[PDB]
Design a protein around this ligand. Sequence first.
Ligand SMILES: Nc1ncnc2c1ncn2[C@@H]1O[C@H](CSCC[C@H](N)C(=O)O)[C@@H](O)[C@H]1O
Ligand SMILES: Nc1ncnc2c1ncn2[C@@H]1O[C@H](CSCC[C@H](N)C(=O)O)[C@@H](O)[C@H]1O
Ligand SMILES: Clc1ccc2[nH]cnc2c1
Ligand SMILES: Clc1ccc2[nH]cnc2c1
Lengths: 268, 257
Amino acid sequence: PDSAPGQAAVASAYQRFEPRAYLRNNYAPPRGDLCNPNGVGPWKLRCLAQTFATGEVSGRTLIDIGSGPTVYQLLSACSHFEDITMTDFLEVNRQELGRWLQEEPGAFNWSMYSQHACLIEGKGECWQDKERQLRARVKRVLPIDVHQPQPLGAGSPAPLPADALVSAFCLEAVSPDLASFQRALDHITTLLRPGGHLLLIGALEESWYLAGEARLTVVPVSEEEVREALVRSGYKVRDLRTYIMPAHLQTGVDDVKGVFFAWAQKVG
Amino acid sequence: ASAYQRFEPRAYLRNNYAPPRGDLCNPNGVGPWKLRCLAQTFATGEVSGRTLIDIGSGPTVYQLLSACSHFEDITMTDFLEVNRQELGRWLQEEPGAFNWSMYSQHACLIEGKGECWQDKERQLRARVKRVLPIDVHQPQPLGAGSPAPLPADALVSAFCLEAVSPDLASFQRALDHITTLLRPGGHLLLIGALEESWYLAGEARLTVVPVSEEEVREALVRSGYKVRDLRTYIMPAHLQTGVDDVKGVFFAWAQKV
Ligand SMILES: Nc1ncnc2c1ncn2[C@@H]1O[C@H](CSCC[C@H](N)C(=O)O)[C@@H](O)[C@H]1O
Ligand SMILES: Nc1ncnc2c1ncn2[C@@H]1O[C@H](CSCC[C@H](N)C(=O)O)[C@@H](O)[C@H]1O
Ligand SMILES: Clc1ccc2[nH]cnc2c1
Ligand SMILES: Clc1ccc2[nH]cnc2c1
């Protein structure tokens, strides 16, 4: 009935979130081994690329929701949108992205990811061009709280409404339970134009994951629960696919059983 | 021969395989053209077999990137000790090895089989069995009883012959010599400079025989080849860099009759 406590537990916990430990855990090998095609890294990139390759998802503006310190989620996207907004709750994540944007050395190195995207998009693009294009198309990096009814604040910088939304491993990772999840989904939906698209990626049946000192709580959701929430928010589900986590990628960083990918189109 | 004694491998790599000639991002550059020729040729599935030899490899490996998934036993060669050492460093992942990874990535891009560049390099490294001395001026260019499995099912050679040959006839004999290493029905992929006469490798100033496409064709024919394919890349102004006077590059696919 009342959300404050749960939300406050969530904000408290993320106060200990360590971005480098998160990157190492989920984006360095073995999870970051893009050489095995049966691995989660290549499956993620594939979903994005295949989705954008339909040409059916385009426009001027895009908002990435809960970017964290990662950019892979925008590699295939950046060729289809002039204007990209990145976002995160945590300043320390916003700074991490700042470092990649300034092309500093001390930044996380996404080049294997960039190269792989270029590889599977099959336009023969070099990875440096791809990266240079993402850095150009990222127009701002903003604070976000998906629990607020206006997740970006009032009269925010972001072009509203966006033609498309991307969100990866955010909603379920910051929502104490399924009702919270649903509301978060409902809040971000106010940012998308009617007829626009949402690409949603996340963890299935996950209850915790590590990010350094911080052990964080996740609402474990199923595919059927994700579909239902999407429908319940005013979306037509165009695609919902599931990746089952192989034992060898279950590393003790979380209890994730699998990953879901959703392409949904806002009805209107 | 004495001219090749002053030959600095890093200065050659830097002059030809680093920017601008080594920027693989523009598809109109000489780098991408070369890899495209190699890749396209192997993708035909007609250049196949068990053993292959690369003639005058110098300190470079790119010429085998697409090849290496078609031949389980690979032999690399060069006249100079220093080049053989520079190859060693990259094969053995040693310190101060040249970084070929942009080229690996591009072969993977071009071949379009969704391969990661690390697997490509791994396979190449595994399939190169030996790096041997060679002198194409010799009738048996490899010497008497070489470690190399002869005759080979195929041959590669890039920028070697025209660059070790004073004139057309010295060039034609060199071709005749290496052609003896190639099993009849075998395949030659030959790449070289068009109408070039000199190029620099650090302190070394090397002499080259200026050859034309028609000259290259006639030579392969006279050596006993059926020219399956012969293409030319004209050298753009922006890639004419003071390190030589190459006018174009040629790629030849030939098959010993
Ligand atoms: N109340 C809130 N509203 C929106 N984002 C939040 C939030 N609380 C935490 N986050 C962000 O949720 C992210 C989960 S990590 C996901 C990182 C990136 N999307 C990738 O795909 O891996 C963290 O960056 C965290 O800071
Ligand atoms: N008499 C000879 N017989 C065989 N190779 C020779 C030779 N004299 C010089 N070479 C080698 O010919 C090479 C020319 S340059 C290296 C070409 C390399 N394959 C690439 O594609 O760039 C040098 O490595 C040089 O040392
Ligand atoms: Cl397997 C996997 C991949 C990425 C993730 N981000 C958060 N949890 C994850 C789990
Ligand atoms: Cl443009 C170019 C590329 C490779 C070469 N090797 C010898 N001369 C060259 C010239």
